[PDB]
Design an enzyme around this catalytic site. Structure first.
Site, PDB file in Angstrom:
ATOM      1  N   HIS A 137     -29.661 -16.696   5.785  1.00  0.00           N
ATOM      2  CA  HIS A 137     -30.192 -15.718   6.732  1.00  0.00           C
ATOM      3  C   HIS A 137     -29.012 -15.166   7.499  1.00  0.00           C
ATOM      4  O   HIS A 137     -28.054 -15.899   7.762  1.00  0.00           O
ATOM      5  CB  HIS A 137     -31.104 -16.351   7.783  1.00  0.00           C
TER       6      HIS A 137
ATOM      7  N   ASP B 152     -27.946 -17.569  10.138  1.00  0.00           N
ATOM      8  CA  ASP B 152     -27.299 -18.802   9.681  1.00  0.00           C
ATOM      9  C   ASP B 152     -25.779 -18.631   9.632  1.00  0.00           C
ATOM     10  O   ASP B 152     -25.027 -19.563   9.919  1.00  0.00           O
ATOM     11  CB  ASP B 152     -27.731 -19.175   8.254  1.00  0.00           C
TER      12      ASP B 152
ATOM     13  N   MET C   3     -28.198 -14.604  -3.249  1.00  0.00           N
ATOM     14  CA  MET C   3     -29.355 -14.152  -2.487  1.00  0.00           C
ATOM     15  C   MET C   3     -29.090 -14.265  -0.992  1.00  0.00           C
ATOM     16  O   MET C   3     -28.395 -15.179  -0.538  1.00  0.00           O
ATOM     17  CB  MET C   3     -30.594 -14.972  -2.874  1.00  0.00           C
TER      18      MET C   3
ATOM     19  N   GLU D 217     -41.282 -13.620  -0.452  1.00  0.00           N
ATOM     20  CA  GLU D 217     -41.584 -15.049  -0.501  1.00  0.00           C
ATOM     21  C   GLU D 217     -42.900 -15.311   0.227  1.00  0.00           C
ATOM     22  O   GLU D 217     -42.939 -15.283   1.458  1.00  0.00           O
ATOM     23  CB  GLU D 217     -40.460 -15.865   0.141  1.00  0.00           C
TER      24      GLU D 217
ATOM     25  N   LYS E  19     -46.289 -17.158   1.850  1.00  0.00           N
ATOM     26  CA  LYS E  19     -46.731 -18.394   2.493  1.00  0.00           C
ATOM     27  C   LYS E  19     -48.089 -18.111   3.142  1.00  0.00           C
ATOM     28  O   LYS E  19     -48.276 -17.044   3.733  1.00  0.00           O
ATOM     29  CB  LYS E  19     -45.728 -18.860   3.543  1.00  0.00           C
TER      30      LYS E  19
ATOM     31  N   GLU F 170     -42.421 -20.022  -3.624  1.00  0.00           N
ATOM     32  CA  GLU F 170     -41.998 -21.372  -3.255  1.00  0.00           C
ATOM     33  C   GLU F 170     -43.067 -22.371  -3.638  1.00  0.00           C
ATOM     34  O   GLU F 170     -44.245 -22.173  -3.330  1.00  0.00           O
ATOM     35  CB  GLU F 170     -41.714 -21.487  -1.756  1.00  0.00           C
TER      36      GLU F 170
ATOM     37  N   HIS G 241     -45.455 -23.620  -0.849  1.00  0.00           N
ATOM     38  CA  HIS G 241     -46.293 -22.601  -0.216  1.00  0.00           C
ATOM     39  C   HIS G 241     -47.573 -22.320  -0.978  1.00  0.00           C
ATOM     40  O   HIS G 241     -48.645 -22.274  -0.385  1.00  0.00           O
ATOM     41  CB  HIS G 241     -45.500 -21.312  -0.007  1.00  0.00           C
TER      42      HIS G 241
ATOM     43  N   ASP H 280     -38.061 -20.560  -5.964  1.00  0.00           N
ATOM     44  CA  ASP H 280     -37.801 -21.273  -4.728  1.00  0.00           C
ATOM     45  C   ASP H 280     -38.372 -22.687  -4.878  1.00  0.00           C
ATOM     46  O   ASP H 280     -39.590 -22.891  -4.869  1.00  0.00           O
ATOM     47  CB  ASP H 280     -38.447 -20.494  -3.586  1.00  0.00           C
TER      48      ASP H 280
ATOM     49  N   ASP I 225     -46.025 -27.294   5.964  1.00  0.00           N
ATOM     50  CA  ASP I 225     -44.998 -27.042   4.956  1.00  0.00           C
ATOM     51  C   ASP I 225     -43.935 -28.158   5.010  1.00  0.00           C
ATOM     52  O   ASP I 225     -43.132 -28.209   5.936  1.00  0.00           O
ATOM     53  CB  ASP I 225     -44.386 -25.676   5.259  1.00  0.00           C
TER      54      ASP I 225
ATOM     55  N   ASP J 290     -41.487 -29.041   2.607  1.00  0.00           N
ATOM     56  CA  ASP J 290     -40.176 -28.711   2.036  1.00  0.00           C
ATOM     57  C   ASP J 290     -39.432 -29.975   1.576  1.00  0.00           C
ATOM     58  O   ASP J 290     -38.250 -30.163   1.875  1.00  0.00           O
ATOM     59  CB  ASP J 290     -39.318 -27.915   3.040  1.00  0.00           C
TER      60      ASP J 290
ATOM     61  N   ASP K 140     -35.192 -24.614  -1.467  1.00  0.00           N
ATOM     62  CA  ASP K 140     -35.514 -24.430  -0.062  1.00  0.00           C
ATOM     63  C   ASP K 140     -36.200 -25.713   0.385  1.00  0.00           C
ATOM     64  O   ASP K 140     -37.418 -25.844   0.292  1.00  0.00           O
ATOM     65  CB  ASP K 140     -36.424 -23.214   0.123  1.00  0.00           C
TER      66      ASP K 140
HETATM   67 ZN   LIG Z   1     -38.597 -20.969   0.558  1.00  0.00          ZN
HETATM   68 ZN   LIG Z   2     -41.678 -24.053   2.712  1.00  0.00          ZN
END
Ligand SMILES: [Zn+2]
Ligand SMILES: [Zn+2]
Ligand SMILES: [Zn+2]
Ligand SMILES: [Zn+2]
Length: 385
Positions: A52, A55, A86, A179, A181, A215, A218, A243, A253, A255, A285
């Site tokens: 991002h 980031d 990406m 992406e 969710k 993802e 998600h 993802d 979520d 992850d 991710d």
């Molecule tokens: Zn993701």
């Molecule tokens: Zn997630």
């Protein structure tokens, strides 16, 4: 099962860099310098990283600060051979985005969101990114009156169309990937699944510039079959990016590292990606659980890649097994791949074997033999042949 850069494994800076802050807890780990993450990931056999805007460059940085951060990052990439395939924009952390970026009720916020995105598209191209992801995590509502969804989708289309106009105007080759969710952090998030994102893309002015970055966790947060969703995305020609992570059913979520969560879904996912010849980044991710220290972070990252490679081996063995190939014929997977009526509509209408003289009882009595096929798949996954 040792990964090398040729395996195309990538990680978000925000993944291994996750400090462990959750809704009910403060950070359990110090922030990582992106330079150290690039180095550590390269040592593990990663191919690249993603970011991002916020980031890589602290929010609110001066042009000078911005340049210095990118400079150090660029040197780390050059020192390691790591790529940046990406990038994306953070349109969710800052309180200004509390009702969304692109679909904020406040028009001035929507405009700011676009400008913030555009600035980072330029940087992404500079660092060599081929895919620009959008996760509309703040786009949605907790209550019914707060968001007119048709109006919100108009605003979402307007935003993506403007971004497409921008990249085209600069002659950039970068493509966009939504992406999805279904919820969290909004009560319900707009374009909540692969299906909703795919359908939305078809209404954009330049649909060819947009795909999905689905993802694992998600789709599973909606109780959906991730491999099925990926197959539909592939069928539509829209799997621009993937993802990878893990999730235990319908809840927040998680992850988890890839392979954790639904293990058999991970197997069928890898089987599909490899069968379809998906050529893009294998991007993770994931959150190393906040129970972990830095050694645990790198162990969890290594586990992502290891599990992909184990599942790749087992899926390949499954498909290459003559006994499985025979089972697939017994279950008529070959027939599924043949046209129903290449002879055409009129021939179908005139074909008495299709209705007037079709023995429905004999057809019904034919077992599909799916359980034998599936136990062969289980045996292959478990290395128990
Ligand atoms: Zn993701
Ligand atoms: Zn997630
Ligand atoms: Zn590459
Ligand atoms: Zn700084």
């Amino acid at each position: 099962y040792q990964p090398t850069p040729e395996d195309r494994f990538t990680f978000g800076l925000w993944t291994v860099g996750w400090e462990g802050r959750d809704p009910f807890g403060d950070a359990t780990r110090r922030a990582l310098d992106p330079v150290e993450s690039v180095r550590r990931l390269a040592e593990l056999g990663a191919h690249g990283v993603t970011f991002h805007d916020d980031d890589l460059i602290p929010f609110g940085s001066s042009d000078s600060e911005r340049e210095e951060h990118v400079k150090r990052f660029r040197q780390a990439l050059d020192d390691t051979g790591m790529k940046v395939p990406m990038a994306t924009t953070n349109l969710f952390t800052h309180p200004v985005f509390k009702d969304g970026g692109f679909t904020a009720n406040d028009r001035d916020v929507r405009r700011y969101a676009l400008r913030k995105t555009i600035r980072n598209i330029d940087l992404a191209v500079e660092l060599g990114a081929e895919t620009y992801v959008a996760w509309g995590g703040r786009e949605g509502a907790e209550s019914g009156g707060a968001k007119d969804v048709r109006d919100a989708l108009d605003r979402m289309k307007e935003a993506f169309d403007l971004l497409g106009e921008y990249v085209t105007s600069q002659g950039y080759d970068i493509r966009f990937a939504i992406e999805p969710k279904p919820n969290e952090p909004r009560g319900d998030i707009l374009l909540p699944t692969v299906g909703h994102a795919l359908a939305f893309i078809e209404r954009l002015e330049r649909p060819e510039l947009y795909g999905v970055n689905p993802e694992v966790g998600h789709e599973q947060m909606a109780g959906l079959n991730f491999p099925h969703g990926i197959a539909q995305a592939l069928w539509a020609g829209k799997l621009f990016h993937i993802d990878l992570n893990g999730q235990n059913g319908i809840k927040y979520d998680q992850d988890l590292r890839f392979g954790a969560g639904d293990l058999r879904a991970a197997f069928w996912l890898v089987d599909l990606l490899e069968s379809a010849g998906y050529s893009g980044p294998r991007h993770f991710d994931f959150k190393p659980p906040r129970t972990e220290d830095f050694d645990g972070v790198w162990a969890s990252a290594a586990g992502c890649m290891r599990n992909y490679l184990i599942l790749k081996e087992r899926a390949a063995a499954f498909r290459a097994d003559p006994e499985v190939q025979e089972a697939l014929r017994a279950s008529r997977l070959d027939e599924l791949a043949r046209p129903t009526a290449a002879d055409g509509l009129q021939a179908l209408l005139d074909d008495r074997s299709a209705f007037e003289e079709f023995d429905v009882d004999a057809a019904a009595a034919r077992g599909m033999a799916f359980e034998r096929l599936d136990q062969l798949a289980m045996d292959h996954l478990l290395g128990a042949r």
